[PDB]
């Protein structure tokens, strides 16, 4: 077990199209699935999950290849990976629509599922990453203050296993720099928290799987150019950190091209890692958006 499971929750596995997915489940009621992003695992949701479990059945998978999940068999593109996560959620809510909360490349791996199966989604919460589309070719390689937000797209996508070869052996060192350079609040990342995340993604198959999502990013862009001809119909909320490392106004501005019904918030003084940097205000916003009118 890689991370402490909170009590009242169970750590379990489920085979989906030949791939064994790890998840943490708890609570009772309508389903809410929480999908983490790069450098992390299900554990980033460990403070929201008990609060949501009071009202919902909460399931928090590890992405294929990451955490304690097997690599995917089809591929790492958004449409491929989303089949895994959609069948997982339907095994737990086969007859009713469920809610989705996704962070970072969790958005990448769920947007195809959402737009193709709109009646299975009651409400949608996306935070802190672009849906893969042509807007990603517009982020600067460099800024007047130093390194830019997403130069690591090219780093991770590079041929010849460039990023795995350089980072291997120095996984804790890199992940700490990556996290801190995308955070405003750098002190919430304790030496133990950093150690837990660094151990998980240092697994050779997990290191590789991390960058394959990025090596598939151009394919996901081409998939979403087709899929985005149907706007999202479920009530949608976007969240972004307004401090150093966050997406700022970009998150809502992009979503205006996707959602009929969108609520947007920018958390002042918070970077990329909203669940840990700004736990209280973030949890409050998710809990309220999923609870209003029910």
């Amino acid at each position: 077990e890689e991370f402490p499971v909170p009590n009242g929750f169970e750590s379990a596995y489920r085979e989906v199209d030949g791939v064994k997915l790890h998840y943490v489940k708890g609570g009772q009621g309508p389903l809410v699935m929480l999908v983490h992003g790069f450098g992390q695992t299900w554990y980033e949701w460990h403070q929201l999950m008990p609060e949501l479990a009071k009202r919902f059945t909460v399931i928090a998978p590890d992405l294929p290849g990451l955490g304690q999940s097997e690599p995917p068999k089809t591929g790492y593109s958004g449409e491929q990976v989303a089949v895994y996560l959609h069948k997982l959620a339907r095994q737990f809510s086969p007859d009713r629509p469920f809610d989705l909360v996704a962070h970072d490349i969790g958005i990448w791996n769920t947007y195809p599922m959402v737009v193709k199966n709109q009646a299975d989604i009651a409400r949608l919460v996306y935070m802190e990453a672009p849906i893969p589309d042509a807007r990603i070719y517009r982020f600067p390689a460099f800024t007047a203050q130093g390194e830019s937000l997403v130069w690591h797209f090219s780093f991770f996508a590079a041929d010849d296993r460039l990023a795995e070869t350089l980072i291997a052996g120095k996984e804790r060192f890199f992940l700490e720099h990556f996290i801190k350079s995308h955070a405003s609040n750098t002190e919430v990342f304790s030496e133990r928290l950093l150690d837990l995340y660094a151990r998980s993604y240092a697994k050779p198959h997990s290191l590789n799987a991390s960058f394959e999502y990025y090596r598939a990013l151009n394919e996901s862009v081409r998939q979403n150019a087709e899929l985005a001809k149907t706007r999202l119909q479920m009530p949608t909320m976007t969240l972004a950190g307004g401090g150093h490392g966050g997406m700022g106004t970009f998150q809502l501005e992009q979503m205006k091209a996707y959602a009929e019904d969108v609520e947007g918030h920018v958390l002042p003084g918070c970077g990329h890692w909203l669940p840990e940097e700004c736990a209280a205000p973030m949890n409050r916003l998710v809990i309220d958006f999923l609870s209003r009118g029910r």
């Epitope: 149907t230 706007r231 119909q233 479920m234 009530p235 809502l252 205006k256 091209a257 959602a259 009929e260 019904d261 969108v262 609520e263 947007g264 918030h265």
Partner: nanobody
């Protein structure tokens, strides 16, 4: 330009109208809004409905106007009860967004082609 406005006209205070926004083709995306523009004043979003049926009204027209979707006829209607001289403007329908920041408003979808609209005079 895939939405054509009709149903306007000259009316007196207290009168009522039904505006029609008709789709010219496919009608799977029914997140559509009604906008009005007075001669000098800016464009304002006054009512929108999402495909799933969620309405929002501008405070200036709430309680008087109703927006509904006629799926079978590929149209969105603006039932305007109790018109007033303040409601005199050109009315446009377009693909729209129910957008909530610190409040909720109806705004147009980025970069829509605005059509002819229909005049409503009181």
């Amino acid at each position: 330009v895939q939405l054509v406005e009709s149903g306007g006209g000259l009316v007196q205070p207290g009168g009522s109208l039904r505006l029609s926004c008709e789709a010219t083709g496919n009608f799977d995306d029914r997140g559509i809004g009604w906008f009005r523009q007075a001669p000098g004043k800016e464009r304002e979003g006054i009512a929108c409905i999402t495909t799933r049926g969620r309405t929002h009204y501008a405070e200036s027209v709430e309680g008087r106007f109703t927006i509904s979707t006629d799926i079978a006829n590929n149209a969105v209607y603006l039932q305007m009860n109790s018109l007033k001289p303040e409601d005199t403007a050109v009315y446009y329908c377009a693909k729209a967004i129910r957008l909530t920041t610190d409040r909720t408003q109806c705004v147009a979808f980025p970069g829509v082609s605005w059509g002819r609209g229909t005049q409503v005079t009181v």
